[PDB]
Design a binder for this molecule. Sequence first.
Ligand code: FAD
Ligand code: FAD
Ligand code: ATP
Ligand code: ATP
Ligand code: 60G
Ligand code: 60G
Ligand code: TPP
Ligand code: TPP
Ligand code: MG
Ligand code: MG
Ligand code: MG
Ligand code: MG
Lengths: 237, 224, 50, 35, 604, 602
Amino acid sequence: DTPSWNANSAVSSIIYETPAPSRQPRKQHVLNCLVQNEPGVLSRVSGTLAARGFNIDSLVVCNTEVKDLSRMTIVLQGQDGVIEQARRQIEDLVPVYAVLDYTNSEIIKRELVMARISLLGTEYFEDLLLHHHTSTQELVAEIREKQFHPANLPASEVLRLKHEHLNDITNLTNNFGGRVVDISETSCIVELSAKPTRISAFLKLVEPFGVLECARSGMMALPRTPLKTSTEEAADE
Amino acid sequence: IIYETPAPSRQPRKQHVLNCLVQNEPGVLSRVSGTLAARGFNIDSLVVCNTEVKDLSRMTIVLQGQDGVIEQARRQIEDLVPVYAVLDYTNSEIIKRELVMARISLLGTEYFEDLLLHHHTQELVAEIREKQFHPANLPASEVLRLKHEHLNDITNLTNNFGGRVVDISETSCIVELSAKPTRISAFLKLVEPFGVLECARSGMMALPRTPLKTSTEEAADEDE
Amino acid sequence: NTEVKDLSRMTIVLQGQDGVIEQARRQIEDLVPVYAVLDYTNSEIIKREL
Amino acid sequence: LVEPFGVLECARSGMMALPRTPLKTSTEEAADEDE
Amino acid sequence: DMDTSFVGLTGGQIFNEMMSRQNVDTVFGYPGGAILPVYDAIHNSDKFNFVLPKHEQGAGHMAEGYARASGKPGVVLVTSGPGATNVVTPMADAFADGIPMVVFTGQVPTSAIGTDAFQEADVVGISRSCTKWNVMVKSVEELPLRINEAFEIATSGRPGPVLVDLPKDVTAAILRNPIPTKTTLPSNALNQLTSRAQDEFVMQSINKAADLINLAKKPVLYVGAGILNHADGPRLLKELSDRAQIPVTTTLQGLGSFDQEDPKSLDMLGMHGCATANLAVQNADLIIAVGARFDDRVTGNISKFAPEARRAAAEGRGGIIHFEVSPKNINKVVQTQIAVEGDATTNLGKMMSKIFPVKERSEWFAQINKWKKEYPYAYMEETPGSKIKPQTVIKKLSKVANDTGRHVIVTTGVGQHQMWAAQHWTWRNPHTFITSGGLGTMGYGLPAAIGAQVAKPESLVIDIDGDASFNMTLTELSSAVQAGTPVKILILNNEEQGMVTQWQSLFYEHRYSHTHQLNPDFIKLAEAMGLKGLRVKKQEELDAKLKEFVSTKGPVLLEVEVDKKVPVLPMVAGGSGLDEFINFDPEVERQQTELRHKRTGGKH
Amino acid sequence: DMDTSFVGLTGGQIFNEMMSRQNVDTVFGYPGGAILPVYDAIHNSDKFNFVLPKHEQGAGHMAEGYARASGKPGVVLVTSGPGATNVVTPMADAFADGIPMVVFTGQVPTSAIGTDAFQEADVVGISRSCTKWNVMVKSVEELPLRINEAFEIATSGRPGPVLVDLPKDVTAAILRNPIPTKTTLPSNALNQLTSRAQDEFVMQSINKAADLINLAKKPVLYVGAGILNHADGPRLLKELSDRAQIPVTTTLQGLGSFDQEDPKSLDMLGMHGCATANLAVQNADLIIAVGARFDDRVTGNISKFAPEARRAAAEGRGGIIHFEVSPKNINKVVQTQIAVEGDATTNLGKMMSKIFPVKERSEWFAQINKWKKEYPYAYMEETPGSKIKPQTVIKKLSKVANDTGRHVIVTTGVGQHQMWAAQHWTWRNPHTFITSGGLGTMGYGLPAAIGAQVAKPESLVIDIDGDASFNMTLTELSSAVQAGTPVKILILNNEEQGMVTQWQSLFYEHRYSHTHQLNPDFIKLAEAMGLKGLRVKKQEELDAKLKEFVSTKGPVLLEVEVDKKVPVLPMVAGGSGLDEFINFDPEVERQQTELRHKRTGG
Ligand SMILES: Cc1cc2nc3c(=O)[nH]c(=O)nc-3n(C[C@H](O)[C@H](O)[C@H](O)COP(=O)(O)OP(=O)(O)OC[C@H]3O[C@@H](n4cnc5c(N)ncnc54)[C@H](O)[C@@H]3O)c2cc1C
Ligand SMILES: Cc1cc2nc3c(=O)[nH]c(=O)nc-3n(C[C@H](O)[C@H](O)[C@H](O)COP(=O)(O)OP(=O)(O)OC[C@H]3O[C@@H](n4cnc5c(N)ncnc54)[C@H](O)[C@@H]3O)c2cc1C
Ligand SMILES: Nc1ncnc2c1ncn2[C@@H]1O[C@H](COP(=O)(O)OP(=O)(O)OP(=O)(O)O)[C@@H](O)[C@H]1O
Ligand SMILES: Nc1ncnc2c1ncn2[C@@H]1O[C@H](COP(=O)(O)OP(=O)(O)OP(=O)(O)O)[C@@H](O)[C@H]1O
Ligand SMILES: COC(=O)c1ccccc1CS(=O)(=O)NC(=O)Nc1nc(OC)cc(OC)n1
Ligand SMILES: COC(=O)c1ccccc1CS(=O)(=O)NC(=O)Nc1nc(OC)cc(OC)n1
Ligand SMILES: Cc1ncc(C[n+]2csc(CCOP(=O)(O)OP(=O)(O)O)c2C)c(N)n1
Ligand SMILES: Cc1ncc(C[n+]2csc(CCOP(=O)(O)OP(=O)(O)O)c2C)c(N)n1
Ligand SMILES: [Mg+2]
Ligand SMILES: [Mg+2]
Ligand SMILES: [Mg+2]
Ligand SMILES: [Mg+2]
């Protein structure tokens, strides 16, 4: 027999689950520099930002299949007056054509993550993470004593758990628009490209399985186009 | 077969569908709803739909009752001055769709019984948390797998019904589905044991199929 | 219509300043047959339309 | 995008919503620099 | 499309001009703050004759009476807030009886709307249920258009009330742009352009209706107020009554549409209707419903309404034919075999050619004559020693009204006096009876009389009120004098709420609870209001003072003390059908007279 | 939990018992067909009294006065159709001024609803926008529940009108099974879970409220009718004005909450409020709103309202503190700096003693008392060779009625007489002023005066009404002599619509469009209604008639012929601020008098 929500208890759960403001009024600023590919352009764009104390999150130099032309998607935080200041500093550099502002534009943000995830369960990962920690103590026996730890399971199991975990990770990866590119005897490698916040969500959901290696890189950006219907385009004045 | 085959019940009931073409003047929504409520009609849903046309709305009213009773409702609404016409889709091949978004827990029945009783504001609390497959008294690894096991079972249901999982958290997974109300309720009943946290059903949107069913009986009907 | 007896959910979209819209929230929430009117602006939500 | 083909008849709903919780990695949420 | 006539004019100046362009010569209303810019423009206008009541409810009812008498829409111009909430009852009354009137209410400035401002009310949201259609003019640009839309709807199909909410900033601002004065109504105007599927469709129903009339053996013409909404209405009704020789029965609001001293007249049917008409309906094989909506007060028990007509429909020998202008009222209470949508008068005129001429009906037309003798309008007649009684009062008043030679217009309140004035008065001319049937509002008589007098100054307007109906809108006597209306106010004083006391004597064992208000002195009241007030107390003082009350030149009041707890008979109540009525019996009333004294303790 | 004490009783019989369960001792209303099963049960009832009018509008207004006088919800029991639609206006009045009342209207049987039945009206839909809550009782099982819900909502938070439809088939049916009795309000579900969060919110805001109080250099206690919704309301009001030494101004509906005999009183502000109060608000650095909603008749112009308080807000010197019971009225007109949600009385009691007592504010009270000296209620006082001035009539009656040693309750209509009755009359003791402000309904004077004496039979009720307003409900005269209410009726007859003619003279060039109604002979009207009628033409006759009326045993009428075209002053209208008022001047009043005749000729 499955119980049902009460008319009152339902409302109580909603307002209790409704999250408090967990974000600043400021937003994710995105600047896209158009630079000339001269020897040392990377070192001076970074140097200009680092020497003036700007909280940058990524840089990412992108080729554009045009000779001697590159573009950098810079992501930073701060006030509008600070970002515009940071923008004008970079643009003043002579190998820089222009620095576009995407902080208020419909863009497509893309990070690329590659991570090897263990299939041997949480117990083994907890053991492995403790083993490599001891460098430069009775827990090693406490972990290897837990249930569902490989050493405490038959050979038919674990094999059945590895593929069960593999199915879970694959289903997580598929739903996020990713793919499993490698399947090891004890692990697997996933590949995912989406929004930076969507990557963070994926790397949190797949975290309990155990992330052996990881490579997140940075965010790339390309402007979308806000298309509206002919009755919403006629909504002028 | 004799034992399982479905059966009716006392005092039957059938569904009627109306489609209103109204002018988007100030009010309207309060006018049609008020007129139908001031006459004690059944009214299962209203759902105001926007046509991509300037100053033209569209409503899909779901009713039940005798054919002469709901006909009174049709003429009652059409008389209203911003209503262009009210069409009856109850005797025509139409496409009725309803949007539903549920949160649905991943922690199972035992935790769901705990969560409901917690917000319902003893001894039965202890017995629930002493069940075998509650998150408590159960290894963190098996909870992790049971989360994704439920996540898969829910995913397979949404897939079969032509839906999709749009969000996945550490304890729940928001699903989306657009289908017939008779199918929406079927899905909500199947995923019910997993424990539905939040839910929201749009109502019913109706659009008639472009008149086409048979190829050989088009002119070989000989009904005349 | 949620899957709870005698409980419905209404989603409203407004335009204007925060001071005007917040008043609209407090004006609806004060009504008798309502439990609480939540503000989903400045919040991560899944907007849907059919 | 479908408009050029010619929309003969359209039914577009209002707007419903369901709150989402923005997940962040344990390394990202560990950044509690509220000094 | 556009118009360059209202350029430079304010919202008030436009309203003043729009009234003359809608052919309006009489405006009822009460001034106020949010309606000031409008009243400033109608100040000493040469277009319409303004009437100032003492209460807004009076202004609305006077507009109803003006519409019931003249036919032209009754315009109401009041203020915002309380001034708009007082015209609710007149609107709901006109919405129930289908009376064409346009109500203009003031409103706070658009900037103040939604701030719980001074004298602010959701007038649109309130009148939404009791008006045909309401609208708030958002700008001066829409003002000439909204008014035209209001007057059209108020007179289209079945006439009704419309509300036009006028904000201050809208009626004060100056229009400086050319604007449209005509837009198509999305519901009927452009939809009716598909006329071929309607004009030729109704023609099929017309032909099938006429064939059923010629096939009818016992046809009853069911006539309502719908036939009065046309000039050639009553004429085509009489013509049909001579072509097929069918008897004609009318409702409370259908009185005056047909001659009652005609052998083909079944008088009024319904709850307190004659047994002749009721038994004619129950035994008819075909009922031609013309301009009626089959009210609960008429049909009685719907499960018992016209059993013979329903049987004839099953045998394909007869049934029910309905002439409605509003399809919403078709198949609402009774199942109609063949309906003829559109104007009743228009549809009757295009059916005469398809109806076979009848010389004389024998069997059934002689049976209804037996019912006229066995079951006529009966009541306890007067005896030496007993005080006056209402039945004989209306009887004599109807005789001294014809003796004048004037055009007699009669309005009533709501109660027992309303029923007696409806059945015992001989109605022969259209638009002569003006009463509240659908909503049944008390205090409707006096102001409706005033409004009717404005429409027809050279007509004898008589108000047959009760002591409870009157003394509700009591203050409007000062308006009858101010407007200079020679109305005739008659009060059947039984010192009680008679209609309710009857229900308490029949269905609640003579247990009268708060059914007796404290009446003032009506002849000292009249003197204070500024008009002479007469009073009849003795039985032999009736006839000699009944001519003085009518021959009086100007506003006059007459209080006639009558008998108490006299039930209106016949009566059809409970689960009883039209053939299960309760007629008059001198022995029963004699027992009820003693039983009442016993249960009440001699109090009444 | 369910009850079982109504088993066997009809719906009407249940209604009768619910009156005693809800402590109702008076029920107004008017019988009818669809409400018959209810009246058959309350026949000679031993639970309550029944005041029977002759118009449903009267019964509604009688319930308002009955509520404002005592503090109990006014009960109205009328029929369906037109009987219910006549109760719309008093419900709109009760919705604006916030008057607690429960209106029971009849209805056609449920099997006839939606068939355009006899005397059927969508009362639920009509009265939806002018009631806090309404419901149509579908079954006799719901009737004991819906009544308890109606009365609770009508008394919870800000008091207001609620309507309950009673179909005939529901009141005639017999209850044969147990029913739930206690209410099911969704507002309680939220406030229970969010109790501590709200409890901490209001306390932490009170601390901040008491902080800016101690920073105020020239504070003003801005009080409304919200303080009158509690017994210890005015009691805690004066004890805050005494402690922190704060001058007190009040709104029209809040009048009586502060005895203006107190040296700290500024009395009424607003459009027709004294210039002393309007200037005090404008020059204030901290305004403490106690139970007021900042009406447009109060603020004059939002753009320039309390400029010094808005200055002190940006400087952190003061601002505006708002004590409010319903969060809907916070920041809907003007923006406050501190919000204290809840009952103003109970909130002040918790903010009390966290405030620093003051000895004396020398400079602030000096300019205030100087403002009284140069800006009092100045008007054209009558000369021996002139007609009676209306303003002095109130001021005369003010002392005459008060020196009788009785409890005096004053009720007015709507117009110039309404303002003049609030300006000159000294308001000692609370709940003594009952008028219509939010909606401003004419004909509100007489019925409310009648119902107010039903609640307070020992008290002396006085109706200061105008001729145009009295003409709307003069019908309810013989109801006062039937209910046994010795009401005192005063008619300041100016033979015109003064409040409208005033606006027409200032903004419409003296064009009086249909503002002169033909008043009947009031003295003979009263005699016709079985009531003692009195008049006064000359000035010397007034002093004898006023003492004759207030001492008259039983219902009495008083008609005073006053001057023509007398504008209420000072006036704050148009796009002017409260400091930009139109002051009185006998010379510009003379010019306005002479130039009026030239544009009229009569
Ligand atoms: C105390 C009391 C007792 C009453 N008892 C009775 C009684 O016993 N008998 C009785 O007859 N009445 C009685 N009445 C009145 C009763 O309540 C209804 O009002 C009455 O039935 C109204 O008459 P009606 O339906 O024919 O006209 P309406 O109510 O005005 O209906 C008019 C119908 O005709 C249609 N129509 C309108 N105009 C046109 C047109 N131009 N062309 C075609 N169709 C049109 C309309 O769509 C509408 O459906 C009583 C009233 C009161 C107050
Ligand atoms: C012709 C005319 C002229 C007028 N001119 C003026 C004028 O010049 N000056 C003037 O002041 N008025 C004037 N008025 C009246 C004006 O229209 C308003 O009705 C008046 O301002 C009422 O203000 P109020 O806040 O005191 O009363 P209300 O309108 O009843 O204010 C209600 C407020 O009180 C609060 N409240 C109620 N109970 C509590 C509680 N227990 N705890 C906390 N808060 C509570 C409510 O939440 C609400 O915010 C005039 C009226 C008329 C008819
Ligand atoms: N917890 C999560 N956080 C972020 N993204 C998620 C999460 N779970 C799943 N996703 C991904 O989000 C995708 C939803 O795609 P969707 O079409 O709804 O984007 P959207 O409509 O633009 O909404 P949004 O603006 O929030 O991204 C899922 O298919 C899934 O790939
Ligand atoms: N352990 C594995 N060894 C080899 N191939 C694997 C393994 N696991 C999965 N694969 C398969 O290899 C595929 C990935 O091949 P991919 O599309 O990346 O071609 P690629 O870019 O040329 O890589 P590579 O250079 O290694 O051949 C997986 O989708 C999967 O089908
Ligand atoms: C009627 O006023 C409003 O509708 C209103 C409401 C909110 C805000 C503004 C207005 C318009 S107003 O302030 O300028 N008042 C007005 O035009 N006329 C006006 N006439 C009076 O006497 C009949 C009395 C009076 O209020 C005391 N107001
Ligand atoms: C008020 O009537 C109803 O509520 C009603 C309306 C539609 C259908 C049925 C009814 C109930 S009823 O037919 O039985 N009438 C009734 O209860 N009271 C009743 N009282 C009258 O005198 C005051 C007069 C009168 O109509 C002539 N009806
Ligand atoms: C406004 C209103 N209130 C109540 C009713 C119910 N009602 C109908 S008749 C009546 C009594 C009136 O009787 P009366 O007017 O004196 O005429 P009488 O029955 O005496 O002939 C009442 C209270 C109504 N129709 N309208
Ligand atoms: C029901 C209603 N109608 C109209 C108004 C507009 N109005 C406000 S005061 C007034 C004139 C009232 O004059 P009166 O009652 O005689 O007061 P007096 O002139 O004697 O001061 C009017 C018509 C209103 N407030 N309410
Ligand atoms: Mg997306
Ligand atoms: Mg299918
Ligand atoms: Mg009577
Ligand atoms: Mg006056």
